[PDB]
């Protein structure tokens, strides 16, 4: 009985809720994306997330959503990798930010 998606690894923190979900790509809400090194990430796109800290500075390298830049995002409690914050590189994009949360990093399984 919950609407929330929590850190699989510590399960102490809610990251987002089902109602944040949207399809940025007409690939639906959650598609498989491949990183440059062969890691596939079923990344769910949500408008808002919380309890996440950022690593590094934003990059556009190999961005899965062109126009947006990624910044690594991890659990504030366990530091487990959760996904990325995506921030638009152009003023005319919408939204200006969302998050892409990796499926294998959340409970329940989506």
């Amino acid at each position: 009985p919950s609407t929330s998606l929590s850190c699989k690894q510590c399960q102490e923190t809610e990251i987002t809720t089902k109602n944040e979900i949207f399809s940025l790509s007409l690939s639906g809400p959650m598609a498989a994306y491949v990183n440059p090194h062969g890691y596939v990430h079923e990344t769910l796109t949500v408008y808002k997330a919380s309890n996440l800290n950022l690593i590094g500075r934003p990059s556009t390298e190999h961005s899965w959503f062109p126009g947006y830049a990624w910044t690594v995002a991890q659990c504030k409690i366990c530091a487990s990798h959760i996904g990325w914050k995506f921030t638009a590189t152009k003023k005319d994009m919408s939204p200006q930010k969302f998050w892409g949360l990796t499926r294998s990093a959340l409970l329940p399984t989506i």
């Binding site: 090194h37 690594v72 530091a79």
Partner: peptide, 26 residues
Amino acid sequence: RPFHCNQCGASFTQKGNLLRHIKLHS
């Protein structure tokens, strides 16, 4: 930051941050 994580793209200045991070992917 010359240390990069192949899994997610995190970059680090210190080797030791990388090690910490990579362990968590386990």
